[PDB]
Amino acid sequence: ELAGIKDAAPDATFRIRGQKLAREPHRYSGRTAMRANISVHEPRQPQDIDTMFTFSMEGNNQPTAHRSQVPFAWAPGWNSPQAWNKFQDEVGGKLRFGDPGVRLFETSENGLDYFTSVPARFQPQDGKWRIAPYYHLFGSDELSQRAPVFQSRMPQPYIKLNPADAAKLGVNAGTRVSFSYDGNTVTLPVEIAEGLTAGQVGLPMGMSGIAPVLAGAHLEDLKEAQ
Amino acid sequence: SIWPYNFGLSCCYVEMVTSPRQADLMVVAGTCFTKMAPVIQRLYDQMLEPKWVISMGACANSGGMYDIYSVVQGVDKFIPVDVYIPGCPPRPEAYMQALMLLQESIGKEQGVYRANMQSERERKRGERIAVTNLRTPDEI
Amino acid sequence: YLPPRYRGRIVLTRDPDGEERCVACNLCAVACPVGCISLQKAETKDGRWYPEFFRINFSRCIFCGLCEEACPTTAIQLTPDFEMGEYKRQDLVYEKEDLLISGPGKYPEYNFYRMAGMAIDGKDKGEAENEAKPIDVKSLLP
Amino acid sequence: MATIHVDGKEYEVNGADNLLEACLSLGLDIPYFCWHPALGSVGACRQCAVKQYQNAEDTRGRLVMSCMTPASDGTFISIDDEEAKQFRESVVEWLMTNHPHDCPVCEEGGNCHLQDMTVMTGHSFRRYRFTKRTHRNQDLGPFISHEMNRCIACYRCVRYYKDYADGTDLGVYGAHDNVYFGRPEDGTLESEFSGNLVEICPTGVFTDKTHSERYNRKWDMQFAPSICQQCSIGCNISPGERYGELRRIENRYNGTVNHYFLCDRGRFGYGYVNLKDRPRQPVQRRGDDFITLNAEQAMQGAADILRQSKKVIGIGSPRASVESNFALRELVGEENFYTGIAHGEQERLQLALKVLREGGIYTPALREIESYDAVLVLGEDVTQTGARVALAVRQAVKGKAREMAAAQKVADWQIAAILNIGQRAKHPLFVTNVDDTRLDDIAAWTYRAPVEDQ
Amino acid sequence: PAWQTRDHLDDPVIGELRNRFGPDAFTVQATRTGVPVVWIKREQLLEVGDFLKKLPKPYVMLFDLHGMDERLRTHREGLPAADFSVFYHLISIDRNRDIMLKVALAENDLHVPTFTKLFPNANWYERETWDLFGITFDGHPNLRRIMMPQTWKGHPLRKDYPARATEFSPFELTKAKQDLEMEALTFKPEEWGMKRGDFMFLNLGPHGAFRIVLQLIVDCVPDIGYHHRGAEKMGERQSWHSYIPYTDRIEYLGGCVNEMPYVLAVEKLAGITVPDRVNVIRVMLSELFRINSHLLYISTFIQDVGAMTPVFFAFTDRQKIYDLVEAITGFRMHPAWFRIGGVAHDLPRGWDRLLREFLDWMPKRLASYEKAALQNTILKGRSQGVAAYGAKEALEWGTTGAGLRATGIDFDVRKARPYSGYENFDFEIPVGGGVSDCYTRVMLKVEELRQSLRILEQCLNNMPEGPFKADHPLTTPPPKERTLQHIETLITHFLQVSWGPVMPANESFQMIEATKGINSYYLTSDGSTMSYRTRVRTPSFAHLQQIPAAIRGSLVSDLIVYLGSIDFVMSDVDR
Ligand code: SF4
Ligand code: SF4
Ligand code: SF4
Ligand code: SF4
Ligand code: SF4
Ligand code: SF4
Ligand code: FES
């Protein structure tokens, strides 16, 4: 089932007329001064045995080179992102020799049967609160929430409630409320969500403390924090 | 009393002019090449026990501007060097200041002696940094 | 005796107001044929670009002066001084504290920030050469 | 399809295209600012001027704009005509009258489209001696810095942000030579696709703030073709490194998937690579003490204990590569290999795989999404997870205006005519979520309900 | 203009080639070389070549022979399909015209017939083409490596070969020990040349250091390549502007003479005509360096074959010339002062008084030199008939300069093909009486030194007014005072020193009269900001190739005198 990955990119013996594909622009600077504060003797250039690319500027990045993997776009007289026009067949089209990437599976000749597993209609329960998942572009992903520039772009941790359910609980916007998941206790400030239906509880998925496995789970206890 | 064997070759020995088994000093100048490097290694071997080597110029200190397939990147790769004199080409006064910087090593002895840790970068620092005004370059 | 245009030791100069003249634009590093300049841009809270570190490998340098003529601030200049010599090649690597001198060198009066549109302390918008005052879009005058 | 005559030579081009996108495909360099391949032609900057003749014998013609001129069969144009060249130089000269002296301290320097076109026209001598107009700046949030003095009024930013990306908080203000591009007041740009403005703006007005902390020029970068790791869409990227740290994230063109645009999580979420807390050497514990090992020591130390163990299991990850999971699977055996995701998340993923492989329904690429005529979104808050699909779905909803304009014989590149014909007519889009989504401004109906009700 | 692209179809050599081989047997390329360029097939190379050798005003000299890779050349409109190419530059003195023949090759079949039978100077050129590219010349007697050592795998001017030393593994001395052992066991396998042979094989190594294997003179074989710096390869990894320092180091005595053909060739690709003040300034610096080189040749010539006590005063005069050069340019040697479109700065305001002091100072010394060398008998007796050659030997081996002019062939480049405004000056071309030897060559140089001082007299009194840089968008860099104040000038300066100036796809070619012989630059642009191919023709390579033909029948002392008389430097030879 993973046989297509061989054709996704060429191997480390692929050459453009004997040249390896370059990683650095041809005007790359500081070769004899970058590492000169540790040792004045220039080290050897890193050697890549895994891929067709070289850890240097001594290689090829021609717009008309027969390849699909283009590390960066540059042309004579076009130093900006507008240099991608030289690498396409028609401007705004596909890359000249084809876009990189291959589809592992093609469309099957025959389809499936109809799924007859229709769920019953949702009903709220006293005590149990369904966890409605809320996702954020700048908080829900594991690696990128550890970026320091994302700390201010992500919102404050909250807990979203229907107005009728917050009226039954007795809270308003901003009140810190406590709940129990799996024997643990987390306290969060309440936010009010009119479009959220009653019996549900909005949590931000993938944050520091709220795992995405919690989607579709249940909160047994919910009360004002003291 | 220092006896100099000058192996200056091209475009770096023209300043030296303006400035076997008998020498104790080898003043390597010029570009050191991959093809001719055994010649300098045998001439270094021929000399007697108390050797001193002065590298002058960027082509002998490093490869200089010739970071190219046919040039070795410095004479210090294969022979020990004592003094380095930057420039392309250096000056006769620099050659004089090299012999003056080397007699201090000849009179200071493992010849570091914990006194050669002081460097001209730090020693002439308060001289060079206090400079404010320089002559305008539209005049002779 | 040396002429004024002599190509010896490379220094970094200062403004007549006393700040370092280098704005870490990296044009001197790229224009060098030997690749003997490394630097990184830093920025003050005032907003002034300046080099975090400036490193010249004088073992490699050929004193061609292409760095001086590349510089759009007159910060890097070549001085009449050939007196250099060291026991170690590692001591031919000069940092910014070995290169930054106390005055403006060959060009006593040029300040780049007075030309530049970018706003730093002492020069808000419209306080540069041949620059008018900013007009807001909400202004009553058509 | 069509044949045109350019500067005496003869070429074969597509008739539906305009003259700028025809001639740029043939390798004929015409300067331009306001045109974009994604955004279409509006005709504002007047930089793309060519001389057009009526036939082969007409010696004195007229200056037209090649972005606004169709490449019909029988077209006679001259890029290198002297009057066209002088006018194109004058357009650069008029833009240079109010431009600040900022290239050493501009982050667009060396990667600036205005710098390239100024050289390409061959305008190097200043005649203007009067004062320059200045603007104050806005705060646009933690990602994008603002410098309005560098603006050339090409209108690419507003055409991308409002028309293409359907953002609401960027507009043009003022009139005549005092036009101001920005927000009504300071604050964060609300769009999830705000960061494409750094590539879309041909000057240094909108620049990457995350890159200006550790800035380096483009020629000092080391680039590799890479894939975004922040979600499942697979946008092609070109990460750049200097001095051992990842510096910026650039869009890598792929005409099948992402083309010119990335999302903000992909563009700005790279900072975890540059953390000081990452392990750089193998580390072995000894009670409370920690021992640092090299690669050879770590392998010999680990396999001594692994030989003495009676059963070794392996836990993979969805954020690890295919070669990394397989190698883990090869080390413990396939009977001892676990995926690392929960059982309920595993059950939804293999059912999602089953309908793609065995459903018999084609699954479109990210750019093929923009050709569809109706979209039903069930449960997936797609702007927050898979954000480039939401950008692709907005373009699909605009297909209704393209169909009406085609019936009235308006060309595909004349975007302001197509938008005028449309007048809020949309292809139908029906989204279901537990709350409101960011696709609600263009959706025909929104259904807020629990997941069983969806 | 003198830079516009021409096919040279009105040259009379093409019409007689049409009437001899037909219209379908070649293909004409439109260049900016100034000469016709014709693509011929390799099966017709010898027929076309020997046809030009017996034209009624024949092409007598093979100027250059080298190769191009051409595999990564994207702009190839009009050319035949080539994977490699070999060019042949031929010169007719009687027509004052040149022709270039280009042979196209495929990557599997790098084979072309040798040109050595027609023109003897082609032997070293084909060995270099075999060394640096992988073209095999069929019929070559000793086709071995002339630049790199004999165990060097790889052809360094191929485009798949990495240029930089850092890209290879450093000097770990694994190969230094093996090369040392090989050099220690210096023995003759009878492969180092013809080597027919009782016979004592001796290696003698002496203004440059090189080895020669001599048979004791029955046979002598120069071994060169000890000073190879990869200058031609360096042109591919440097921009057009940042390559300029490397030009100054092809010849150490040349200085600004060496920069002149390169900047003139780049200005043809740029389409720049320079102002008159640029022409007079460039001619001034080139005649100053020419005087310095000629005084060095006359000085060193008098020291080896005579008493060196009076002529040591010439060091003070060379010190005055170096002080005047570093007053104008900045630095005594390797100025790197010529720019694309002009020079680096204007002349400083006190230049006239120093040049006037040098022009007043020089005639007394010059007339003492004429007395010291023209009237002497001992050096004249040791320099007359010492390895002499004539006009037939000069034109065979591509010998130019004082050598060629010492025979009856009056051929200067400054009069035949004027460059840099040399045609607006009043100077004479000295010439010998048909025999080129050691006395005649030195006497010619004394006459040339006086003519150079006449050119400097006209430069001081007719120095015109105006810019030191052309007004053109490819003038690199722009004037700095405009760069420091004006944004469009700053934008042009920003991209020119960083990415580089964009030269459009063409081929240019310039020849200048150098301090020693004729130096040329053949530059190819593929439309980028770096050169695709840079070819440097140095006359010393031909002059050093000519010595085994003339020294055969002489002593070792005659070899030392002949080597001291010829105008050769090993930096020129190996580049
Ligand atoms: S250091 Fe400079 S002057 Fe000396 S040999 Fe090398 S290039 Fe020539
Ligand atoms: S020295 Fe000049 S060119 Fe170099 S970084 Fe500083 S301002 Fe830029
Ligand atoms: S003088 Fe030349 S070699 Fe030295 S740092 Fe400046 S550009 Fe580099
Ligand atoms: S936007 Fe471009 S032209 Fe304007 S200052 Fe920045 S780099 Fe220079
Ligand atoms: S801000 Fe940038 S994209 Fe917008 S109009 Fe100005 S120059 Fe064009
Ligand atoms: S949609 Fe955004 S996060 Fe997902 S792959 Fe593309 S750029 Fe990365
Ligand atoms: S690009 Fe055509 S008018 Fe602006």
Numbering used by the authors:
A (entry chain G): 682 to 907
B (entry chain B): 53 to 71, 90 to 179, 190 to 220
C (entry chain I): 39 to 180
D (entry chain G): 1 to 454
E (entry chain D): 9 to 205, 210 to 218, 224 to 233, 238 to 596
List sentences from the manuscript:
Respiratory complex I is a multi-subunit membrane protein complex that reversibly couples NADH oxidation and ubiquinone reduction with proton translocation against transmembrane potential. Complex I from all characterized species contains homologues of 14 core subunits; seven subunits each assemble into peripheral and membrane arms, joined at their tips and form the complex with a characteristic L-shape. The peripheral arm, exposed to the cytoplasm in bacteria or the mitochondrial matrix in eukaryotes, contains binding sites for NADH, ubiquinone, and flavin mononucleotide (FMN) as well as eight or nine iron-sulfur clusters, seven of which connect the NADH and ubiquinone-binding sites enabling rapid electron transfer. Here, we describe the single particle cryo-electron microscopy (cryo-EM) structure of the entire catalytically active E. coli complex I reconstituted into lipid nanodiscs.
Micrograph analysis, in contrast to mass photometry, revealed that large fraction of the particles corresponds to the peripheral arm only that may have dissociated during cryo-EM sample preparation. These yielded 3D reconstruction to 2.8 Å resolution, similar to the map of the peripheral arm of intact complex I. Joining two subsets and applying density modification improved resolution of the peripheral arm to 2.1 Å. At an average resolution of 2.1 Å with the local resolution in the core reaching 2.0 Å conformations of most side chains in the peripheral arm, positions of ions, and multiple water molecules were resolved unambiguously. The relative positions of all redox centers with FMN and nine iron-sulfur clusters, including off path cluster N7, are particularly well conserved. A distinctive feature of the E. coli peripheral arm is the presence of ordered C-terminal extensions in subunits NuoB, NuoI, and NuoF with a length of 22–45 residues and a large 94 residue insertion loop in subunit NuoG, referred to as the G-loop. Similarly, the G-loop fills a crevice between NuoCD, NuoI, and NuoG subunits and together with the extensions increase the interaction surface between the electron acceptor module (NuoEFG) and connecting module (NuoICDB) by a factor of three (from 1400 to 4600 Å2), thus stabilizing the peripheral arm assembly. A strong density near the NuoG surface coordinated by GAsp617, GGln632, GGlu647, GAsp731 and four water molecules was assigned to a Ca2+ ion. Divalent ions are known to increase both the activity and stability of E. coli complex I. One of the calcium ligands, GAsp731, is part of the G-loop, suggesting that Ca2+ stabilizes the fold of the G-loop and consequently, the peripheral arm. At 2.1 Å resolution, 1170 water molecules associated with the peripheral arm were modeled. In E. coli complex I, cluster N1a can be reduced by NADH due to its uniquely high potential (~ −0.3 V), differentiating it from other characterized species in which N1a cannot be reduced by NADH.
